[PDB]
Amino acid sequence: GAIAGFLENGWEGMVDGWYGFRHQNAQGTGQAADYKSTQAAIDQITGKLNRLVEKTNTEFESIESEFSEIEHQIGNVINWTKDSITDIWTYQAELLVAMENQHTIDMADSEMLNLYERVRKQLRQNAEEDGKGCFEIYHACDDSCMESIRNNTYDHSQYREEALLNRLN
Amino acid sequence: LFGAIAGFLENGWEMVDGWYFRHQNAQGTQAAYKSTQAAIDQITGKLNRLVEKTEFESIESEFSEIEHQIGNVINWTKDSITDIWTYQAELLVAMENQHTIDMADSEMLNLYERVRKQLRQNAEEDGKGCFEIYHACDDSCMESIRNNTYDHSQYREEALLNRLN
Amino acid sequence: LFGAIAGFLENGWEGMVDGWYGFRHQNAQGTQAADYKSTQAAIDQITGKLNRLVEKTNTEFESIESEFSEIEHQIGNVINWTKDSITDIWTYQAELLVAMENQHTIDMADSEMLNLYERVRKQLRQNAEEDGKGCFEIYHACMESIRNNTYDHSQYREEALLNRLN
Amino acid sequence: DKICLGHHAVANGTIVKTLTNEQEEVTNATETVESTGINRLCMKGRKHKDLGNCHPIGMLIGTPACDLHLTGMWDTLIERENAIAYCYPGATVNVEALRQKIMESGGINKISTGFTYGSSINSAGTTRACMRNGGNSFYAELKWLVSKSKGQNFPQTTNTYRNTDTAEHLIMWGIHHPSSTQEKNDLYGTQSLSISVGSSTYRNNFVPVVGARPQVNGQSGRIDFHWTLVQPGDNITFSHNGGLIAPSRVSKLIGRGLGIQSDAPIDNNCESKCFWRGGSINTRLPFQNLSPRTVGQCPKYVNRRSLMLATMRNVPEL
Amino acid sequence: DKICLHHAVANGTIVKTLTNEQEEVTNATETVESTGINRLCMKGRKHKDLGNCHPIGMLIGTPACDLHLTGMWDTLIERENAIAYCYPGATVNVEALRQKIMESGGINKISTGFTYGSSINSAGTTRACMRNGGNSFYAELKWLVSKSKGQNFPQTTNTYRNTDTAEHLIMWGIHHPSSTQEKNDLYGTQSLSISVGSSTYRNNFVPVVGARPQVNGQSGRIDFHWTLVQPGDNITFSHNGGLIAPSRVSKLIGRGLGIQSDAPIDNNCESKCFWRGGSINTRLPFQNLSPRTVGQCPKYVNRRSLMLATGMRNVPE
Amino acid sequence: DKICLGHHAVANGTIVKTLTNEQEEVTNATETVESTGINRLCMKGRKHKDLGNCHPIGMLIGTPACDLHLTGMWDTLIERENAIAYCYPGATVNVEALRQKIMESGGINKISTGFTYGSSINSAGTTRACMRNGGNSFYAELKWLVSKSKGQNFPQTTNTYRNTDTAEHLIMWGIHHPSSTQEKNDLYGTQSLSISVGSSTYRNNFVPVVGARPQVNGQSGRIDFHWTLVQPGDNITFSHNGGLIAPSRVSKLIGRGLGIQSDAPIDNNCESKCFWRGGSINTRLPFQNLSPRTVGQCPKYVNRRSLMLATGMRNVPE
Ligand SMILES: CC(=O)N[C@@H]1[C@@H](O)[C@H](O[C@@H]2O[C@H](CO)[C@H](O)[C@H](O[C@]3(C(=O)O)C[C@H](O)[C@@H](NC(C)=O)[C@H]([C@H](O)[C@H](O)CO)O3)[C@H]2O)[C@@H](CO)O[C@H]1O
Ligand SMILES: CC(=O)N[C@@H]1[C@@H](O)[C@H](O[C@@H]2O[C@H](CO)[C@H](O)[C@H](O[C@]3(C(=O)O)C[C@H](O)[C@@H](NC(C)=O)[C@H]([C@H](O)[C@H](O)CO)O3)[C@H]2O)[C@@H](CO)O[C@H]1O
Ligand SMILES: CC(=O)N[C@H]1[C@H]([C@H](O)[C@H](O)CO)O[C@@](O[C@@H]2[C@@H](O)[C@H](O)O[C@H](CO)[C@@H]2O)(C(=O)O)C[C@@H]1O
Ligand SMILES: *[C@@H]1O[C@H](CO)[C@@H](O[C@@H]2O[C@H](CO)[C@@H](O)[C@H](O)[C@H]2NC(C)=O)[C@H](O)[C@H]1NC(C)=O
Ligand SMILES: *[C@@H]1O[C@H](CO)[C@@H](O[C@@H]2O[C@H](CO)[C@@H](O)[C@H](O)[C@H]2NC(C)=O)[C@H](O)[C@H]1NC(C)=O
Ligand SMILES: *[C@@H]1O[C@H](CO)[C@@H](O)[C@H](O)[C@H]1NC(C)=O
Ligand SMILES: *[C@@H]1O[C@H](CO)[C@@H](O)[C@H](O)[C@H]1NC(C)=O
Ligand SMILES: *[C@@H]1O[C@H](CO)[C@@H](O)[C@H](O)[C@H]1NC(C)=O
């Protein structure tokens, strides 16, 4: 919903992280990466990579002479079996990938929407819903205040009425 | 479960081309494109994967009969493979239906949030998927919603007075 | 994935022994409940279940290899290869099926929590402020209105608005 | 003043399965498993062969029923249910492996052995088990060698076939087992009989057996057939004493092709990449439940009634 | 004045997910049975435990196979050291045949009405075959020998004739003498030959003398050969002797489950899935006890335990 | 004032597949199928034997190529395309069966049969096909029995090998079929010839057969090889009239090894657990697309060159 939907673009400029903070302030404008939110995505991606390569195989032996003749009927029976096994394992591979891509993408999509909600309900009344994945803050929020918000430390109760004012007038 | 289809929206209305409006005002009383096209493509997307296609040769004969031991081995391998492919058919259909149902519901709920964020503070949602709008809205306003050209700011001043008093 | 579990809600209530989802109750009067068909909407699918798992796609098999005598060596190896391969399939198929229907279960358990939550906050409307720990700040005064889908929002729109604005 | 959101719904919704629900109904669902097989054989685009009541092995040894099908090449091969393999009663050894070489094969060509026989020998053997033009005959590509002077000993004979061509050749002979000691004596004499066969790759020895057996096709006698591959630039030597059925021509198998075992009637116009004992199968659908044994580029066989894949949740008014 | 909106538990088993191994959960169930009944469960099945009788023996008439020479069965059971051969011998196509018997559902027997000349003593017996205390032989096989020692065995022809609706399996034996002195005694000095031909069979056997070790104290051998006699088709035996002609012809009826196992029978318990160690019953779709199984069954997998989550994430405070 | 939320993107990003969309760009992906296999046989840790030209059968029989490899010990055995199992032309019964047992075998061991021959018999018979030093020679575990006197009939003989050891043993002998009757007469005399084999388990009769056959290795005469298992404490007897190629030692397969048919040269300084004809494979990846035919603990073969597994988010650019 968040990436293919209402967040219109991704910022190429960001390099430290997957998920970003950028704000418009009078003193300065800044770009911030959230260590916690990106780390969540990276942990669940490396989890899939692990489950993918955590495969141990039973040892196998030849049933097909490479350098000698094989009787015709038994050859046909092995050919039909070896090829049917192969067909299953190719369909099982296409499933695995097409299914876990569906899921990798959407996991990534939700972790953003979760960060976005995290900020939004954190603000409570001091700000409002712009569908640019942006929040108009209705008070002067400075450079200490900006990642007061990204530390998640930010407390609405002390800006309080100032924020309600000029929202109201 | 996304809230809409099995949650706060209570039923569907028996709308003509569009999977996903109805508004009520004094001079007039339905509309459904981008939202549905977002959904329908995924349905074909699943269908296209289904159709795409090795050769196989006869290993047990129909009109002669086959040496017993090999005939049994052929039957056992053939049987167990059908067992695996049936499991796969049952699982894929079960799963892709699990996703199919729950995808339309996504393209439903995001349309809801698109709207709720677009009216911003000039309406309240009442808990059943209707938005109650305090500031009066003619038809030509409604169409400003459907084409996403609806400005919240200019109505805002009139709204808040209605909400609070 | 959904923000609700291991998200804003910071642990579970080990005290709760009834129901997956419940209400923690605070007001001057009194202080724990449980919402009924948010947790059986959930049980219906947790017991949609193992119906998949335990319905028997049962085909009858015979024995292709005797245990109590020599089997001819060539056909012996063909059998041991076909069966080693059919196992390496089902061991995969099993491992995916539980690990994928675990992933589906785990992340559907909050969905209901979130839908309960957003049900509630649509009931409460402008009468309450979220507080972001899944709690709701209520700025007015038989609170099973919200638990049992009763609560009128206009009824105390009223003083609560101005309890916010003071 | 109000605005309201919502989704479509349908009056009689169809039902489907999920991982959580045994019976979920939905606005629409389609079929994932095929069932409506086409009974005829859909042989369009294929250059093919319907042998009719001719068996494949019959082609290599030339049974009369098989006379038209002695050579040629095919996209695909078709065998009827009641096909005649042996007119005179006999069996073939490793016949299944042989029949499959033919079914895999694209085409057959026949190359003469060049065999010639002494005057004491009678090359022109016949039986009423094998009939051409309503008269007694023998297999087209084989010669039945008996003694022309009845009772007299079969002369010791040597026949050699040399594989000059670049391709490997498939060669078929027969070992005739009489019924009487009377009968054996009349054709071949009182000799101790033996047939021995050698090439660089193949060595084997054959001895005819007198036995008493019930009539088949009106004949107590038996002729069992054997076959081998003659690799190029190599020669196979036939040393025989009385009892051999000697090849006058030799088979060559060409290319790779489809083989179909079906008794269903041909329909030339429709095209299929799939076949079974009933006709063909035409579909995009990835699964099917018609029959567990097919041939070609075919969908996988599943033991289900049907599997339904949804194309949303249908919630009715109330 | 506030309202708050899950349960956790003290102990959470860990399941595996697509992203997370080791993920705690409130409850999880096993999808693989790893415990299976030691015994064989035989409720509601009409079955036959051959004991130390080999399945081949039933058709041949081995002395241990006497109370098994006929019957009917849903299920058939075989045991670890069953006795097929009273007398030293091997069977041609023994594995192609044992399977045929273990997937049948009963055996009927028919007399062949064979009738041997007055030159012929058919009451042959060995001390490999000890019925009670006496020399006996295969129940459905008559060891023909010439009645007067050393005298040449007569050329004999015996023809079975199938008149029943379904095909009959017919079994016969060929005798291979230990020493050339011994061959002349029983059948004579002549050149031996046995020619067995029907409509869908021809063959021929010639008794071979050779020095051989003693098995059950006998050096000579009886090889056993079998074929199916179609309905309406006769089979003819022409012999100089050394034929162990069939007095009777087995018929295989219906289809049944064949189990090879050493587990003891229990008719208290129900099942449809058996292996060597006995039986497996459950509705878990997987299993890791044994790879080789018989009848409708759960599929074999390598893993000892697979945990399927039945609950939400377990987060203690 | 404003505060924004955004994901990242990259200038160029990898493409992946999903259940609903075939074509979905993502920031990053990783290959899950391995095609960069290796070209040597990594035999570090594996005690191995490289056969070279000797075919496995030749180990048992005693062919001149494998004269180094008559007795061995390994957890891996490596066969080569140029394999030689025969000197004198011949074939072996159940050859694939025997071959497969040897390729599974972790070892081979040899025990003298100890057979003794009388004055009339010549133990040493050699052929120009099998040359050791230069001087003609013969298989190093058999012996070719012929009469010392060219005309004379072979003496009737009994030879018995007894397996004293605890484990079961594998014994091979041969039957020699002469090209012409005169040949047969020189070697074994004019008498009818019968070899008879017998053990507790095993009973058989062989008769040498004279037929004209094409020369291979310069010899029209042929030798067919037979094998069986001698159970522990069992004894096996050979009553023969001549035409027997008789064992001078017996074989005893030991343990379990890993059979490999491979064109690749050894590298004894890397480790590996998967092997094909081409080489060896070391990969983290589950699936593989090089070889349908593989041996040991190997990744499954899938009919696809690439499957990309997205390891990043949906990529949406500026
Ligand atoms: C008096 C009476 O009961 N009726 C006899 C009748 O049985 C007999 O018919 C013949 O029997 C002989 C052998 O006993 C042959 O089998 C005759 O058939 C042929 C055949 O067509 O197959 C004739 C043919 O010429 C023969 N081929 C050659 C040249 O070898 C073959 C051959 O003998 C067998 O195939 C060998 O197995 O047999 C069959 O008609 C006749 C005269 O024989 O006399 C009646 O009165
Ligand atoms: C005059 C002419 O055309 N050239 C002949 C030449 O053909 C012949 O060469 C020999 O032919 C005989 C049989 O005809 C042998 O095959 C000779 O080879 C050996 C062999 O090395 O294989 C010799 C060996 O001593 C023999 N082994 C024993 C002791 O049995 C074997 C044996 O006969 C066969 O293996 C049996 O199948 O054959 C081969 O050189 C020579 C003299 O023979 O004279 C030329 O002038
Ligand atoms: C009547 C008959 O043929 N049966 C004999 C039997 C046969 O001689 C033998 O099975 C042929 O292979 O041999 C019986 O035992 C005898 C021994 O007791 C003896 O001491 O040696 C005999 C031959 O050298 C012979 O084997 C037997 O199997 O019981 C006696 C029986 O009547
Ligand atoms: C194989 O031959 C050996 C030797 O003749 C037989 O074993 C001997 O066994 C007997 C009794 O079992 C002893 O009295 C001898 O002392 C043994 N001899 C030796 C040197 O071991 C054995 O019985 C024969 N095998 C068979 C099955 O007949
Ligand atoms: C196959 O037969 C041919 C002919 O008998 C053999 O080749 C010939 O060699 C002889 C003697 O060297 C010549 O007299 C012939 O003229 C040759 N024929 C040709 C066509 O050149 C050939 O050696 C035999 N093949 C085998 C494998 O024995
Ligand atoms: C269902 O969908 C398929 C394709 O979407 C269509 O052919 C059909 O008309 C639809 N309705 C039904 C159930 O017939
Ligand atoms: C079987 O034998 C009877 C009498 O011996 C005879 O009528 C019949 O023709 C024979 N059947 C066959 C198929 O040979
Ligand atoms: C690309 O994906 C691989 C595999 O997950 C990973 O090693 C690498 O870090 C990724 N690239 C970046 C820039 O993170």
mmCIF file of C-alpha atoms in Angstrom, chain D residues 115-117 121 143 145-146 154-160 174-175 188 191-197 205-206 237-246, chain F residues 210:
data_model
loop_
_atom_site.group_PDB
_atom_site.id
_atom_site.type_symbol
_atom_site.label_atom_id
_atom_site.label_comp_id
_atom_site.label_asym_id
_atom_site.label_seq_id
_atom_site.Cartn_x
_atom_site.Cartn_y
_atom_site.Cartn_z
ATOM 1 C CA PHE D 115 21.548 -64.345 -48.813
ATOM 2 C CA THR D 116 21.607 -67.186 -51.353
ATOM 3 C CA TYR D 117 20.943 -70.916 -50.816
ATOM 4 C CA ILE D 121 17.676 -76.300 -49.621
ATOM 5 C CA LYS D 143 12.717 -66.944 -45.657
ATOM 6 C CA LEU D 145 14.699 -72.742 -45.134
ATOM 7 C CA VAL D 146 13.820 -76.440 -45.380
ATOM 8 C CA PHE D 154 20.057 -80.092 -44.065
ATOM 9 C CA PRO D 155 23.411 -79.172 -45.574
ATOM 10 C CA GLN D 156 25.751 -77.195 -43.322
ATOM 11 C CA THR D 157 25.294 -73.582 -44.347
ATOM 12 C CA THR D 158 27.039 -70.285 -43.715
ATOM 13 C CA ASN D 159 25.436 -66.890 -44.248
ATOM 14 C CA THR D 160 27.118 -63.567 -43.553
ATOM 15 C CA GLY D 174 13.786 -66.787 -36.299
ATOM 16 C CA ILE D 175 14.363 -70.149 -34.610
ATOM 17 C CA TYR D 188 15.723 -81.309 -41.490
ATOM 18 C CA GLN D 191 20.850 -84.496 -37.570
ATOM 19 C CA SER D 192 21.766 -82.975 -34.225
ATOM 20 C CA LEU D 193 20.651 -79.409 -35.030
ATOM 21 C CA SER D 194 22.363 -76.120 -34.092
ATOM 22 C CA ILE D 195 22.257 -72.425 -35.086
ATOM 23 C CA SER D 196 25.149 -70.165 -34.025
ATOM 24 C CA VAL D 197 25.434 -66.392 -34.486
ATOM 25 C CA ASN D 205 23.708 -70.060 -29.994
ATOM 26 C CA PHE D 206 20.263 -71.459 -30.821
ATOM 27 C CA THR D 237 27.834 -64.489 -39.353
ATOM 28 C CA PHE D 238 24.994 -67.015 -39.396
ATOM 29 C CA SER D 239 26.049 -70.634 -39.002
ATOM 30 C CA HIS D 240 23.127 -73.013 -39.241
ATOM 31 C CA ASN D 241 22.292 -76.651 -39.501
ATOM 32 C CA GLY D 242 18.537 -76.742 -39.978
ATOM 33 C CA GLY D 243 15.868 -74.734 -38.218
ATOM 34 C CA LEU D 244 16.904 -71.162 -38.987
ATOM 35 C CA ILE D 245 14.487 -68.640 -40.412
ATOM 36 C CA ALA D 246 16.819 -66.441 -42.396
ATOM 37 C CA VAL F 210 31.866 -73.377 -32.088
#
